[PDB]
Design a protein around this ligand. Structure first.
Ligand SMILES: Nc1ncnc2c1ncn2[C@@H]1O[C@H](COP(=O)(O)OP(=O)(O)O)[C@@H](O)[C@H]1O
Ligand SMILES: Nc1ncnc2c1ncn2[C@@H]1O[C@H](COP(=O)(O)OP(=O)(O)O)[C@@H](O)[C@H]1O
Ligand SMILES: Nc1ncnc2c1ncn2[C@@H]1O[C@H](COP(=O)(O)OP(=O)(O)O)[C@@H](O)[C@H]1O
Ligand SMILES: Nc1ncnc2c1ncn2[C@@H]1O[C@H](COP(=O)(O)OP(=O)(O)O)[C@@H](O)[C@H]1O
Ligand SMILES: Nc1ncnc2c1ncn2[C@@H]1O[C@H](COP(=O)(O)OP(=O)(O)O)[C@@H](O)[C@H]1O
Ligand SMILES: [Mg+2]
Ligand SMILES: [Mg+2]
Ligand SMILES: [Mg+2]
Lengths: 378, 378, 378, 378, 371
DNA sequence: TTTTTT
């Protein structure tokens, strides 16, 4: 029969082209589910799959006028839509899917069954994803300097590890976190270390979504956190200076449901899946709109008490009560952090903590007995 | 003469392609009506029906350029439009229509007269639609814990059942329902169970449809409520605070009308069909701009008075006067909801309730003796 | 010579295709003038007229690539434009034009003379257009309950009849009517009956047409009421609340003009012909920015006083002065309205009322005494 | 040599297609110059000039694909622009140019010299352009009623005649006339008479051209008033209200230049020729943004005094201050103007007035002493 | 082979098509560097140039699709852009250019090296470009009447001549001129004279260019000054009130730059080359955002002290202090102004003044001794 | 501002 239809049927039998509910046509090229709303990539898959089909078909898929016919046949056989990103314990890279339960790494068809549209952005190095490397020792030194293992810092370190490790789970979390500490403590260092580990599954969204009604008009500060594993918010100002807004309590309750309401510019889609692990990076203790039992259930605080200063104010910083350690400020850190040195070394630590803390079910618990207002209300 | 016109005529005689009043071309593929404003699906239908014509006609539909000719002929033969969704007592799925008055599943031509352009988005498996199941007992235990079967909570339970079961009828409901209660009481669990049950006939919007005006400029928060059978507008703020917009009474009055005025972006269609049951999962007592009988005859309140807590906070919850019974939290409940485990059991429960409350006429009644301001005006 | 040129000239000899001043190519299919700026309509008529040409010509029109050549010729032979909708007292249906003055129904070539570009959207049943019928008997009871035929409600009843019957004549009306009354008095029932009666010549818009500037940017709320014979703008909010926009004084003046300024999206046409009977379904008395004699001559108010109540709250309706009668609510009325039961009985009633007040000349008059502010100014 | 090139050259030899400085392609069909960016005017002309070519060149213009080739050649052959609408004392009609200074109606090729692109839209009849006729008597009575010939209404009647007769000359004016007066006085009747007299050369625009900056993207409210003789911007609101825009003094400077900017949707033509006679039908005297000495020289105001009252409210009008005559209303008058009964009578009256004020030089003079602010500044 | 490619190469070898840095293709048809971003004129140029090619090639350009193929080839072979409008001493017309250093009119290939994309809007006829004419005498009388040719107004007259004549030099200018006077003193008369003389190389703007930042929102008032040789800013309010925005120093310091940063509606090109002599006409004393030494080196002002009133108001205006001579309002003066009879004469005066003042170096010197 | 355009 029509031999340009047999090619389309054979290509479709591989389940390489899929139709999503949002109207996209996700394709499977180079071990990744890529999609582009502006230009479909079906003709890319048709040309890439050329080697699987027999020799009698390969000579015909080179002409673009035949590739267009094959794409037209394919688009008329995808009738139903499927579901995407339904596996929480899977981290999608640019060349496979890392399994978090047993720390495996599947590529090819083995990674095809997990339909994950998002990706980390970079490739996975099985040789660099090891616990025996000088990078791992350097990282373990940096982390222990930021958060020591002293018994005075026992719970605060386990909570920190839990919060950081929950940044790899593709499931909805029902608790915020507050990276609270004085200046020059490691919050922006932890943020940069985490961004170097996940990459594309990370946005440092604006502060405006703590004090603004995210309902009227456009708000791309919300539409960006669609399927993002981690969302970081900084810039908590003083609540006594002019412009002292209040962290809207009802707004905190909105960033806990699996679907957040908000649309981008020139768009009609109003619901965004909430896989984020929102971490508010603050320096001063936050002042809330109004405290109630519904608000105290979805907040955790990770205290930061360690100062990395230059040998000018070291003694003055030591005399201060806001810190507990006065370790020496290093300059090579920001060099080999933005340059992605401790990328896989931090990934191994995150996977280890994820195994230690959330194997059966991923869940974040509040710590309300840390904020003075909450302590008063308790 | 032209056989590509005979094919189009034969396809037209089957009454598989129809023209709607909005200008869409609804096709009939896989026992369900489908449409897409961006790209027509007539070619999909032409290629699909190919298995119902003789051999001399079944081979001509493989070439896309010969399919566009049939599509052009079909578009040129459709003159007069039709009206859709005229049957309120039917629930459409991806593979047929369930008749609620008899609880009978019709597939194929048996369910084609009921031109339902919407669907739940999943198949209907008749093996999970029975009482004899382990999942049904678990769902019964969950619901009887959220709303206990006592005698001080009998009218409330009946109102809750009526409100939940009204989400299957595709008619205009003239009441607004508030899910009022303290934190951790079962409101979001009910919302998620309803979403799993009715599937895609369920849209969650922001609160901007109650505090802003739905007339100026675009408003896809209202344009998305077209032909949807349930709407959730949860997370009401605290109107007792300073700077909280009250609920506009006129906005409440619009939402209980057969047609709601509101347009999407880049669109001129200004009218949308209101088949939705609007439920406001609130946490505080609502406050309105003005109170009058027209507002008092459109509001119903159902209360949640069962707190699900951990053993850690089990003691502070018993002294609270906002609860009637304290149960133990279930950490794994959320996992087997997003997996659609209690999906068809809840569907059977809703159908059973609809068979009991809304058989002759479907109607929702107000409960003015639940808001203190309404009680004063009573 | 050219077969297709002769085919195109023959179609133009039938005077079926026409060009209007607005730039629309109206065609004559199924005894009705139809126009649509996006769908292919000239090819539709070309395919439909096929059973007029001889056999040697009737076979070429089965190829879509040949039906576009004939359309291209027809679009080139049309030089001059014509004027449409110049008869005010003719009501067009989907299969003819009803003459209001005498009641004769023309179908076929006799209806081609009145170039009415709009239509009701359904056929005209001469069998149901009779005075003696069960539905006509129930409708009379419904109306006599909504507006009783007493002696203190005779001027109001005749004003209501005038306003309702004026929705059939396609001429500019220089007055706006307010359906005033407390809740549950029969206004929405009248609106639904009118919508079922006049069909497509009825558009419902928001109150943005009353309090906004209807001139800047796209505005499909004004662009949609082009040639519509009735425009309902319900849901007027309270004005006693500080924060409510008053009804703009000049908008009322602009809406009573033979041509309204406003354009839809993706278009340049800025003039819409005003045939509408604008009816505002309000609950409280309207408040304007400024009151002047230029505005009291453009406003009429008709009151609804019969209250339809449930047996429980019936007693409370006997002490409110806002009612003159307490009828018992019929729960099944809305079922047999959306099903188009009183469609032709109401049409007969509207025609009978029309040829009793508007036969010499159709004109509407204001009632300034029925509004407190105008009463003060007068 | 070529066959489809000689046809294009011959069509050019007839001087039927011309290019303007704005990029328009004006064609000559049916004794009139026409330009339309949407319709295929060049292809219509190619089909219509088919009889003036040799027999062998006539049989090729039947196929649309040959006509498109001829049109493509014609577009390439036109490399130079020509001046259009240079004669200001000529009035175009659907079938020829009428000379205002002399009075002879130039029909056919004799009207080709005066390249008048715009037209009135209706054929000119010399049997109705007569001086004496019952229609003329009725029109003269109506005009004398609207503006009485009394001694006080002498300096105002001639200004009214000047303003009305300036709408025939196709030259840029320098004043903005305000039809100031109370309600039911005659402004709308005068506007309707002028519209029915001058046909297509009349347009009505919104108040954006006065109270908004006309330089934001597309603005068809300005692109529509290109080469139009008269423009109406009626129904001005009150300015001494809690929130209301102003006349934007700077915006009046732009409306007197012959280079008004503003492009229609889907087009690039930004600058439009300004032959318009801006007339604002208002009820309250305008309030500008800033009053300067450059504004009193481009503003004229004519007062309307004669009241048209119903027999009922006639006594209340005889005591009103802003009225000089209480002549009875006429219901059967405003229905006849839309029937173009006084079309040619009003055209003859306008020509008679034109050959009384605008023969040597056409110029509009301002009347600044009428506005209170300018009177105080004097 | 591929005769169409040979046709494209032969057409391109004549430098009839050029590519601009802004991404537009400028063609050369009928003695004019035309361009149209929406509909390209390359096919018109191919059909026109058909005559200079051999008959074997010239017989193929009659088919509209061969022309499109050659156009595609031409657009493919234009890789690098060229610098246009590099000559400041040339005034472009609709059918030629004018050389002010020699006062010579160039037509045809004699004016193709001078790549002048913008034009004036009308053709040139040198027969009416001579002093020997009465309209010459009437216009010279008007000019000496608006600015007396005496010793009490010598420096003012020379600065007025310099500023008005600078409007022909197609280069950047670093001095903003102010026109100071009372009502009915001759500002708008000079404005209409300039608009009639030069035409398209002239844009009239509003007060907005002195009160708002030039890089917010879609603003053509920064983009419309592309290659324009004049900006006559009017509608300046009285600065002795409340709510009337004053003049910003940053605005003035920005307008005196060779390029201006500003993006039009639906466009990304923020750069616009500025060649405009900015003459702001005022009615009262100006006040700026700040007064410092960085500003008085770019601002010049001239005075007008002659007012015109009708013979009815002759004695009513013959007794005023703000003026010194009062003739009668001439209605016929404005008559042959939109008809543009007094167009080439004023052009001749401008050329004469340019030859008198701007031959060696083009430079405007500020006069901070009057404000 | 966005949306509308485009
Ligand atoms: N483990 C460490 N040992 C020594 N120096 C460190 C260590 N971690 C971070 N620093 C240095 O201290 C600084 C900490 O800054 P940081 O606390 O991230 O800023 P912020 O307080 O704004 O978040 C960094 O610039 C880094 O160079
Ligand atoms: N029988 C039960 N029914 C419903 N939820 C239960 C039950 N037992 C434990 N839970 C848990 O209690 C939690 C209640 O939270 P929820 O009521 O959804 O919050 P909200 O106050 O926003 O409605 C849920 O996460 C659920 O997993
Ligand atoms: N003539 C009638 N007889 C019996 N019931 C009626 C009649 N008219 C209306 N009803 C019922 O009473 C209710 C009136 O509500 P509605 O008229 O919509 O309120 P409103 O007038 O405020 O819009 C309707 O639901 C309708 O079913
Ligand atoms: N010459 C006339 N003789 C009698 N009635 C007239 C005359 N001119 C106008 N009318 C009446 O005046 C009415 C129009 O008033 P209109 O001009 O719309 O008021 P406004 O000036 O407030 O717009 C029409 O209904 C018409 O019948
Ligand atoms: N020197 C002059 N020669 C001829 N007419 C003049 C002269 N000065 C002023 N006028 C007259 O004054 C009017 C313009 O005055 P102008 O100073 O431009 O005020 P505005 O700027 O408000 O128009 C013109 O109509 C012109 O006839
Ligand atoms: Mg919740
Ligand atoms: Mg109602
Ligand atoms: Mg009027």
């Amino acid at each position: 029969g029509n031999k340009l239809f047999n090619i389309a049927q054979r290509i479709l039998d591989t389940n390489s082209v899929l139709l999503t509910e949002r109207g996209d046509h996700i394709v499977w090229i180079n071990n990744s589910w890529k999609f582009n709303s502006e230009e479909p990539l079906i003709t890319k898959l048709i040309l890439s799959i050329r080697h699987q089909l027999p020799k009698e078909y390969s000579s015909e898929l080179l002409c673009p006028r035949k590739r267009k016919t094959v794409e037209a046949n394919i688009r008329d056989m995808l009738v139903d839509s499927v579901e995407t990103d339904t596996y929480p314990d899977k981290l999608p890279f640019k060349n496979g899917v890392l399994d978090l339960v047993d720390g495996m790494f599947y590529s090819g068809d083995d990674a095809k069954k997990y339909t994950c549209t998002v990706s980390t952005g970079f490739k996975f190095d099985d040789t660099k994803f090891v616990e025996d490397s000088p990078e791992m020792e350097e990282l373990m030194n940096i982390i222990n300097d930021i958060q020591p293992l002293t018994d005075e810092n026992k719970k605060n370190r386990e909570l920190y590890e839990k919060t950081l490790s929950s940044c790899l789970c593709g499931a909805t979390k029902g608790c915020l976190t507050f990276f609270f500490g004085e200046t020059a403590t490691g919050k922006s260092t932890t943020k940069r270390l985490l961004k170097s580990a996940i990459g594309d599954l990370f946005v440092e969204t604006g502060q405006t979504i703590l004090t603004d009604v995210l309902d009227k008009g456009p708000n791309p500060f919300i539409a960006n956190m669609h399927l993002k594993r981690s969302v970081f918010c900084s810039e908590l100002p003083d609540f006594a200076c002019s412009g002292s807004k209040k962290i809207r309590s009802d707004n905190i309750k909105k960033l806990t449901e699996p679907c957040v309401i908000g649309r981008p510019c020139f768009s009609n889609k109003i619901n965004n899946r909430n896989h984020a692990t929102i971490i508010i990076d603050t320096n001063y203790k936050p002042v809330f709109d109004r405290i109630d039992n519904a608000l105290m259930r979805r907040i955790a605080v990770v205290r930061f008490r360690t100062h990395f200063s230059q040998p000018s104010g070291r003694e003055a910083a030591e005399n201060n009560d806001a810190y507990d350690k006065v370790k020496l400020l290093d300059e090579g850190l920001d060099g080999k952090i933005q340059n992605n040195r401790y990328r896989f070394a931090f990934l191994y630590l995150l996977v280890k903590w994820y195994k230690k803390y959330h194997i059966p079910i991923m869940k974040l618990y509040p710590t309300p007995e840390e904020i003075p207002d909450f302590a008063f209300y308790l």
